Ligand binder design. Structure first.
Ligand SMILES: CCCCCCCCCCCCCCCCCC(=O)OC[C@H](COP(=O)([O-])OCC(O)COP(=O)([O-])OC[C@@H](COC(=O)CCCCCCCCCCCCCCCCC)OC(=O)CCCCCCCCCCCCCCCCC)OC(=O)CCCCCCCCCCCCCCCCC
Ligand SMILES: CCCCCCCCCCCCCCCCCC(=O)OC[C@H](COP(=O)([O-])OCC(O)COP(=O)([O-])OC[C@@H](COC(=O)CCCCCCCCCCCCCCCCC)OC(=O)CCCCCCCCCCCCCCCCC)OC(=O)CCCCCCCCCCCCCCCCC
Ligand SMILES: CCCCCCCCCCCCCCCCCC(=O)OC[C@H](COP(=O)([O-])OCC(O)COP(=O)([O-])OC[C@@H](COC(=O)CCCCCCCCCCCCCCCCC)OC(=O)CCCCCCCCCCCCCCCCC)OC(=O)CCCCCCCCCCCCCCCCC
Ligand SMILES: CCCCCCCCCCCCCCCC(=O)OC[C@H](COP(=O)(O)OCCN)OC(=O)CCCCCCCCCCCCCCC
Ligand SMILES: CCCCCCCCCCCCCCCCCC(=O)OC[C@H](COP(=O)(O)OCCN)OC(=O)CCCCCCCCCCCCC
Ligand code: HEM
Ligand code: HEM
Ligand code: HEM
Ligand code: HEM
Ligand SMILES: CCCCCC(=O)OC[C@H](COP(=O)([O-])OCCN)OC(=O)CCCCC
Ligand SMILES: CSC1=N[C@@](C)(c2ccccc2)C(=O)N1Nc1ccccc1
Ligand SMILES: [Cl-]
Ligand SMILES: [Cl-]
Lengths: 48, 49, 49, 377, 105, 49, 48, 48, 75, 50, 251
């Protein structure tokens, strides 16, 4: 019923390993660019 | 001048002891800042390469 | 066949009970089961059409 | 600068690069692009399945088998397409829920065609599930098409005219394949009009307050967040493809279609179970069908039911609770829809069915009027 | 005037703190949904209220991005929430209703 | 013209000539005792006797 | 299949290519079925 | 296809029954012969 | 569409920003991150949890009844 | 909501009433003609046939 | 005025109604819209054929037969689709000849993608003619696909990779049907980019001289001329469909 059984699990292992690498690296690229905004500071100086 | 991107700009090389500020400064209408920065950086890159 | 409350026909899809003559009694079904235009020619014989 | 003046790259620029976007849109705003990705995946996996599938009852079941066994890497293409469709409906339901919680429906044009985008996807996945021609495919196709027989006077004519016969048979499977092929391109066209009306105003944001005072360019900030989100979308898909392909699929669909007997209990795919429950909650033919249509067409009249002086529910606790009672209520109707019409699931299915329409039409509109008076305006 | 209309305020102060826009340093009128009437009222605000409204909203969208709030010391107190917009907004509506009554003569 | 056009196109979706040509059914009646429901095949849909 | 019913007292042995996937429980069901035969409980009398 | 072009329905029916064609399976799984009906294609003279 | 430079009017607001190569992309990820997640869940749990607990109770009761409603009684 | 009930709006209603009832005749007759609705088309004298 | 401000009707307005057009463009400028009509006809007749056609060698020939004999009015749908394809190529060749004689190719972007629109239509009609699976379909498909075997080094690999075998067989007929289905929608997308670049400049005219001094609105002047032209396009098609369907087809 499922001749692809073994091959799909071998691929599944490779998919998990690549995701364990790519997810934190892509997460790191997101945080890298966004850090400009996440640490920005604002000040309001109206005339008096 | 052709596209009227600014009223004025000037490059500068401000020197201090073991440091300095190298770049440019300009004055323009509110809808021309992006175009001025594009052309400015494009010339820096073009002279680098 | 031969299921449901009325000992006739039952439909498990949504719960429509029929009797031995195919008449709807309970259920969301609005009409009795359809009968075709048939006739009996001889004893051990029948035509449907 | 050529990015801003080339007539072709101009439209790309104003949509993905220099488009002003709010600075505070959360992960719930990621599902718009994931719908686009899901669509692209269903085009490509769909297209490469259509090069090996045949559209006639004798070998329609066997051609899908032929893909999963004989063609190189067709089994993975096929489960991507099957599970891609389910991921499509996850994203659809998050997309809508985002719009309701944060009040994005006030974009009438964008919202009202969004409803149209929901119906056409359902019509697509419906005509996709028929194609493998298993048992669930056949009788699920039978229950649905007979909904039109409930229309008075012209009912039976529309059904037999759709069928091309007196029941779902060879003629239906062929046209349904033709419809399933062409509809996802119509969807892409309407999704482009979805964006066109959207860009007229820009995005809402978690607060419901105008973000004109604080916008950031879409690139690089939301290009990268949409990538990260897509990488989590691939993760969700591949976990289903490579570790649980038949979790959402029903076993009965692995037996060729038999037009002579049904299974003792039929259940739609998960993404239609809430609506199937509403249908069965009424012991009337035409009543059940109308309650099914209004179950989805209720979205079209949400904007007319907005009573709050605030747009988002972020600052409306009493609406938050009624919103989550709707998710639980919808999660209840999904459970009933997957269960047989028997005691006590029947009466539960009716109470959850009223609670659905009661929340949208009564409790949530008046709940917004209360909290307006609690805030003295 | 009495003790019954005083716990009425207590539940409105309660709903206020639960609604939680004061946690972002915001005022009730900062959260009104902008329609044509509201956009007109904002247009009519003097420069000081307009600029204050702009910064409070900007400060809140900044916080919302980070999923943060201000310290409790800096929350908007229910007692000090100036309904600065409803006078302008109520006059906008009043003018519109007048046009609508003339439109059916 | 637009009517005949649209008419001929919608009629294309209606059942073809080979769908309306499905013959009728004969049934040997001595096959079935009393109290039983046997199902037959007629026009693709079951035929309960 | 008509010849099959006649050769198997009216019952149809299904094709087995997909049997594990077309029944809930897969090999757990099939393993339990094959090895699970037993005498009928009191009061159940199956036709020949 | 002959009906209403060059023969009546009754004529074309009588014409179809003048030849014998294969049908089945019956309930025993056997193929057998019966007279043609209007829905039958013209008999092929050779199987291949 | 809408463009930068035609959105709205802002006055007297200063923004300080640092380059992304000068700062850390994960600063105090667990030091400040977890306490913020606790505050966020604490602030919303009472609005989200009850309806889904209500669903859980109906779900177990309904199955518990159905799972045994087809049991037999001596009568 | 009730902006549109007063002296002037009932005058506009009565001005466009003769027109809308004619577009209902276009649609109704157009629906009969397109679908070949026989229940109506029997009493009209000339089209009776085929 | 809502015709000019609704974001959807704005794009229609600037393309079919208030679009400035030259006052002197002749009948040779009618073939742009007739290509669009031809495309629409090939979509609709094509779609209604795909509801009764089957894509495998055993019954691919027979399913087309099934259309011309058994389905209501399918024979007329099928000859419309077959002759519609030939009308498509008449209009294509007039369209190009107009562009060469009157110099319209100086619109580089419009012209250079027009070339792309020519190739994709040829690729479509090629993969359409294979589907009925007659003799000409099969061997015409054999001669064409073997053109790639002439590429040095990688020739045979591309052919057998296109074929899905060692010759045109069941695997090709299935994918060619899939390609023939999807390409006419890609065409419509590129035809929209055809117009987008065109409207950047407006139309040329018989003289080759700028017509800015004397423009007329597209509506009502060229809406009606495009109708009249289309009515002559239907005439050409229906004469082929209803009086000579097998004149261009090979026995
Ligand atoms: C997988 C299924 C996950 C369902 C989503 C649950 C909600 C969530 O945390 O969203 C994460 C994520 C965070 O997005 P965000 O922009 O930071 O905030 C969105 C809301 O404003 C968030 O609303 P909020 O501001 O009121 O805060 C809710 C809070 C919710 O926090 C929690 O409930 C997690 C508590 C777990 C503690 C650790 C125990 C182990 O969100 C978080 O703090 C981030 C989650 C941290 C996870 C850490 C797990 C370890 O949101 C989503 O992706 C929602 C879609 C997820 C569906 C995936 C199904 C496929
Ligand atoms: C179906 C597919 C659905 C797609 C959903 C789209 C999601 C999306 O596009 O936005 C991601 C969106 C991005 O979050 P973010 O950029 O960090 O900003 C969050 C706010 O600033 C909030 O600021 P925050 O300081 O409150 O952030 C709390 C912190 C979470 O705080 C924690 O540290 C909780 C972790 C407890 C572990 C204890 C070990 C000690 O970050 C998160 O909430 C993300 C949780 C992911 C944890 C994965 C493990 C690392 O949220 C996520 O879910 C990130 C997941 C990315 C996977 C990373 C795996 C490595
Ligand atoms: C594949 C389909 C291809 C589609 C092509 C698109 C054609 C298109 O859209 O423009 C039509 C375009 C429109 O011409 P026009 O609007 O009259 O303006 C022509 C110039 O102003 C030229 O001014 P003109 O004064 O020199 O015009 C000469 C006059 C033709 O002068 C004549 O009187 C020759 C007729 C000799 C018959 C002798 C009997 C006495 O008109 C024509 O050239 C049209 C010939 C059509 C004659 C049909 C019989 C009436 O030319 C045509 O071919 C008209 C044919 C329409 C059929 C009418 C049947 C009644
Ligand atoms: C015309 C072209 C059309 C293509 C359209 C593609 C549609 C998009 C679907 C995306 C599916 C994700 C991967 C599944 C395959 C698999 O699981 O990969 C299995 C192979 C092992 O394979 P093996 O051991 O058999 O051979 C081994 C021979 N050396 O390694 C992997 O684990 C790679 C997967 C890693 C994790 C996925 C991360 C996703 C990143 C985005 C990339 C998307 C590119 C899109 C390009 C169009
Ligand atoms: C019609 C289809 C029916 C099909 C049935 C499907 C089965 C249902 C299964 C339930 C899965 C639920 C997903 C998990 C949701 C967790 C949300 C949460 O953790 O946070 C609540 C959040 C509050 O955050 P605020 O935005 O108010 O402010 C943040 C300040 N730091 O508030 C928000 O984040 C809420 C945003 C919207 C959430 C989307 C979920 C709704 C899905 C279906 C809606 C369909 C309605 C017609
Ligand atoms: C194939 C279907 C769809 C696609 C591709 C799609 C795509 C998108 C995208 C990319 C966005 C902008 C980014 C975002 O907010 O995530 C968006 C926004 C929106 N969509 Fe959809 N969508 C689809 C269906 C729907 C449905 C079913 C609805 C509602 C019933 C809907 C209503 C909305 C609304 C109201 C917005 C504005 C949200 C905001 O900016 O706050 N759309 N859509
Ligand atoms: C939004 C787009 C789409 C969705 C949600 C979708 C969904 C589905 C679903 C749920 C199935 C049932 C799969 C199964 O039960 O095995 C299916 C089957 C199929 N789809 Fe699609 N589809 C989409 C687009 C397409 C396109 C664009 C094509 C072809 C050009 C296509 C071709 C097919 C084919 C040939 C099958 C039958 C093979 C099979 O069952 O795996 N699909 N589709
Ligand atoms: C599916 C294919 C095509 C469609 C639907 C199409 C459609 C159109 C339309 C509507 C116009 C404007 C009106 C007109 O001049 O008739 C036009 C203009 C033009 N087309 Fe095409 N065309 C196609 C293919 C081509 C091809 C094959 C070429 C050249 C090899 C081409 C080159 C041009 C040029 C240069 C113009 C400008 C003519 C002018 O304004 O003087 N196009 N096309
Ligand atoms: C510009 C667009 C198109 C062109 C030029 C075109 C051309 C052709 C041609 C020349 C044939 C051969 C007909 C024959 O020899 O009998 C054909 C067949 C066919 N076409 Fe198309 N076609 C187009 C679009 C489409 C579309 C969009 C579909 C379906 C959605 C389609 C479906 C079919 C089918 C099913 C056949 C086989 C039936 C038959 O041979 O008549 N076509 N096409
Ligand atoms: C919305 C699509 C309508 C499709 C109707 C259809 O296909 O035609 C059937 C009937 C024929 O008229 P009748 O007198 O035979 O009557 C036969 C009765 N079954 O025509 C009608 O009755 C037209 C009714 C239109 C109502 C919206
Ligand atoms: C055509 S069989 C079918 N198509 C699906 C995928 C679908 C139906 C409706 C809308 C979208 C998708 C579905 O759930 N079913 N099953 C099924 C089972 C019982 C009753 C109805 C459908
Ligand atoms: Cl299968
Ligand atoms: Cl032929």
């Amino acid at each position: 019923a499922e001749p692809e059984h073994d091959h799909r699990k071998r691929m599944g292992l490779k998919m998990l390993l690549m995701m364990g690498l790519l997810l934190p690296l892509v997460y790191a690229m997101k945080r890298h660019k966004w850090s400009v905004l996440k640490s920005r500071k604002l000040a309001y100086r109206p005339p008096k | 001048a052709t596209n009227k991107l600014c009223q004025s700009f000037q490059t500068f090389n401000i020197c201090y002891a073991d440091t300095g500020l190298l770049g440019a400064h300009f004055v323009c209408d509110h809808m021309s800042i992006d175009d001025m920065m594009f052309v400015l950086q494009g010339q820096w890159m073009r002279l680098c390469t | 066949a031969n299921a449901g409350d009325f000992g006739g026909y039952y439909c498990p899809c949504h719960g429509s009970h029929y009797d031995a003559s195919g008449r709807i009694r309970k259920g969301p079904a609005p009409l009795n089961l359809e009968v075709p235009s048939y006739e009996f020619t001889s004893d051990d014989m029948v035509i449907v059409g | 600068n050529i990015r801003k003046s080339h007539p072709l790259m101009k439209i790309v620029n104003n949509a993905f690069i220099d488009l002003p976007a709010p600075s505070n849109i959360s992960s719930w705003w990621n599902f718009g692009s994931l719908l686009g990705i899901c669509l692209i995946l269903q085009i490509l996996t769909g297209l490469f399945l259509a090069m090996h599938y045949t559209s006639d009852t004798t070998t329609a079941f066997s051609s899908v088998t032929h893909i999963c066994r004989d063609v190189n890497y067709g089994w993975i293409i096929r489960y991507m397409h099957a599970n891609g469709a389910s991921m499509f409906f996850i994203c659809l339901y998050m997309h809508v829920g985002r719009g309701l919680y944060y009040g994005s429906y006030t974009f009438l044009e964008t919202w009202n065609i969004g409803v149209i985008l929901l119906l056409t996807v359902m019509a697509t996945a419906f005509m996709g599930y028929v194609l493998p021609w298993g048992q669930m495919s056949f009788w699920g196709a039978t229950v649905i098409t007979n909904l039109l027989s409930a229309i008075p006077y012209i009912g039976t004519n529309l059904v037999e005219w759709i069928w091309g016969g007196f029941s779902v048979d060879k003629a239906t499977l062929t046209r349904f394949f033709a419809f399933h092929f062409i509809l996802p391109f119509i969807i892409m066209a309407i999704a482009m009009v979805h964006l066109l009306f959207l860009h007229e105003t820009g995005s809402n944001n978690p607060t419901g307050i105008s973000s004109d005072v604080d916008k950031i360019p879409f690139h690089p900030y939301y290009t990268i967040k949409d990538i990260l989100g897509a990488l989590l979308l691939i993760l969700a898909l591949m976990l289903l493809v490579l570790f649980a392909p038949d979790l959402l699929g029903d076993p009965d669909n692995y037996t060729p279609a038999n037009p002579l007997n049904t299974p003792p209990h039929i259940k739609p795919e998960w993404y239609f179970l809430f609506a199937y429950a509403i249908l069965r909650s009424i012991p009337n033919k035409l009543g059940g069908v109308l309650a099914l249509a209004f179950s989805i067409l209720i979205l079209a009249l949400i904007p007319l039911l907005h009573t709050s002086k605030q747009r988002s529910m972020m600052f409306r606790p009493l609406s938050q609770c009624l919103f989550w009672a709707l998710v639980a209520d919808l999660l209840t109707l999904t459970w009933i829809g997957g269960q047989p019409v028997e005691h006590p699931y029947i009466t539960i299915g009716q109470l959850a069915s009223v609670l659905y329409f009661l929340l949208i039409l009564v409790l949530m509109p008046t709940a917004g009027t209360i909290e307006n008076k609690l805030l003295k305006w | 005037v009495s003790a019954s209309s005083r716990w009425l305020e207590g539940i409105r102060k309660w709903y206020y703190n639960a609604a939680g826009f004061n946690k972002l340093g915001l005022m009730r009128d900062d959260t009104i949904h902008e329609n044509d009437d509201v956009k007109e009222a904002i247009r009519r605000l003097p420069e000081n209220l307009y600029n204050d409204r702009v910064f409070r909203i900007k400060r809140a969208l900044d916080l919302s991005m980070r999923q943060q709030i201000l310290p409790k010391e800096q929350w908007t107190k229910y007692e000090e929430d100036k309904s600065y917009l409803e006078p302008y907004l109520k006059e906008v509506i009043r003018e519109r209703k007048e046009r609508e009554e003339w439109a059916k003569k | 013209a637009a009517k005949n056009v649209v008419s001929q196109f919608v009629s294309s979706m209606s059942a073809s000539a080979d769908v309306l040509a499905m013959s009728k059914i004969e049934i040997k009646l001595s096959d079935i005792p009393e109290g039983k429901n046997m199902a037959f095949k007629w026009r693709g849909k079951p035929l309960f006797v | 299949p008509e010849a099959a019913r006649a050769a198997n007292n009216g019952a149809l042995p299904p094709d087995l290519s997909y049997i594990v996937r077309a029944r809930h429980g897969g090999e757990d069901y099939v393993f339990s079925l094959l090895t699970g035969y037993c005498e009928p409980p009191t009061g159940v009398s199956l036709r020949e | 296809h002959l009906v209403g072009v060059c023969y009546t329905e009754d004529e074309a029916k009588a014409l179809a029954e003048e030849v014998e064609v294969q049908d089945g399976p019956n309930e025993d799984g056997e193929m057998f012969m019966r007279p043609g009906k209007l829905s039958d294609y013209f008999p092929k003279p050779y199987p291949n | 569409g809408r463009q930068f430079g035609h959105l709205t009017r802002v006055r007297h607001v200063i923004t300080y920003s640092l380059s992304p190569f000068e700062q850390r992309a994960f600063p105090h990820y667990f030091s400040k991150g977890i306490p913020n997640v606790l505050r966020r869940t604490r602030a919303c749990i009472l609005r989200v949890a009850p309806p889904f607990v209500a669903f859980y109770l109906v779900y177990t009761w309904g199955t518990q009844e159905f799972e045994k409603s087809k049991r037999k009684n001596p009568a | 909501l009730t902006r549109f009930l007063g002296p002037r709006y009932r005058q506009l209603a009565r001005n466009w009433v003769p027109t809308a009832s004619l577009w209902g005749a276009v649609g109704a007759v157009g629906l009969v003609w397109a679908t070949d609705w026989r229940l109506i088309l029997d009493w009209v004298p000339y089209i009776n046939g085929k």
